[PDB]
Amino acid sequence: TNFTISVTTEILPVSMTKTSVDCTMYICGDSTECSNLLLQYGSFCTQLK
Amino acid sequence: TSNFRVQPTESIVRFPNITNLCPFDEVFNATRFASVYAWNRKRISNCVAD
Ligand SMILES: *[C@@H]1O[C@H](CO)[C@@H](O[C@@H]2O[C@H](CO)[C@@H](O)[C@H](O)[C@H]2NC(C)=O)[C@H](O)[C@H]1NC(C)=O
Ligand SMILES: *[C@@H]1O[C@H](CO)[C@@H](O)[C@H](O)[C@H]1NC(C)=O
Ligand SMILES: *[C@@H]1O[C@H](CO)[C@@H](O)[C@H](O)[C@H]1NC(C)=O
């Protein structure tokens, strides 16, 4: 015999913050020998980028 | 493609001043030496080690 106009809130996530990292700076930094040693590993951090 | 970096040139400030000589000859050229069970310990600090 009666009706109620109810209101509800529904929350869904949309997206997260984009994060960009680099192999050379994060792993060791400015070491040239570290870069030379990492160059022999291949393109792992290129694939990560 | 890559990252941007700034090249370095040269240092800024030195170590503590080094103008002495570490007496390494006290433990190297000694008149008498000690035994294995009771050796001698000499603390060497605040000097230049060669
Ligand atoms: C259906 O329900 C609503 C409330 O959910 C009723 O509205 C109330 O009516 C009384 C008397 O008419 C008022 O004193 C209230 O202030 C009203 N409430 C609101 C929120 O407006 C309504 O009367 C009901 N319908 C029937 C046919 O009984
Ligand atoms: C050298 O050492 C002395 C004390 O050992 C210090 O006072 C002084 O600042 C140092 N540097 C120079 C350039 O004299
Ligand atoms: C003897 O002492 C001198 C300085 O006192 C030192 O230069 C030298 O190494 C020591 N040993 C020998 C075998 O000369």
Output the CA torsion A24→A30→A34→A38 (10° steps): 20
Q: How far apart are CA A36 and CA B4, in angstroms?
A: 18
Nearest CA in chain B to A29: B5
* B29 to chain A, closest Cα gap in Å: 41
Q: Quickly tell me which residue has 């030195």 as its tokens.
A: B14
- Provide the residue type at B17 as one letter: N
> What technique solved it?
cryo-EM
Resolution (A): 4.3
Spacing, Cα A7 to ligand 1 middle (Å):
18
Q: How far apart are CA B10 and CA A47, in angstroms?
A: 35
| CA B33 to mean position of chain CA atoms | 24
Contacts with A22 from chain B: Cβ below 8 Å: 3
What's the token pair of residue B44?
A: 């060497």
Q: How far apart are CA A13 and CA A11, in angstroms?
A: 7
